[PDB]
Amino acid sequence: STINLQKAWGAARRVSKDDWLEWLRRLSLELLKDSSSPSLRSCWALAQAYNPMARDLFNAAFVSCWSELNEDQQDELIRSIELALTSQDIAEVTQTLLNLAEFMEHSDKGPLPLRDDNGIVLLGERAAKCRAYAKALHYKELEFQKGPTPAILESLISINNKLQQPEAAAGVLEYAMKHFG
């Protein structure tokens, strides 16, 4: 359990993209080592052997171990994840972390408390930088549903243009102008 944090705390020592990939791999392997389900504790050895089995099973073992970890330990792992997100722009690690965020948003347990407002800013930004333009649109619409803001409306217009749908951009602009100046 706590071992999973020890690799996670390694996020405070990674700089290069290969270093962050190694961090994700080692965290995946240790998550597999002490998974609640024996079907993953058995696959720990194979994940060490191959590598991509650690990637595929990273979400599954992460969910169970994070569930077992208490509030402080969960917050520590979350801070490690936030260091990874705010440190370097890596499509693979960022997309994997965004997938974790998506599952936790969908799952009844609630989203990861990655930062303030669940990192809906950062997540959206990352979804724009990893070219997941629809993902960034979803995060920007989560911001929108709290209330219309000129920055939010302009960001939606930009994302709609980025999604090659001028119709949505025009409609968003019309809504913005009718609602406010």
């Binding site: 619409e141 929108f144 939606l156 749908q165 119709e167 949505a168 951009a169 025009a170 409609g171 968003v172 019309e174 809504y175």
Partner: peptide
């Protein structure tokens, strides 16, 4: 429906 509601895609 979308953020635009009627505006944009639906009216078009």
């Amino acid at each position: 429906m979308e953020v635009t509601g009627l505006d944009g895609n639906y009216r078009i």
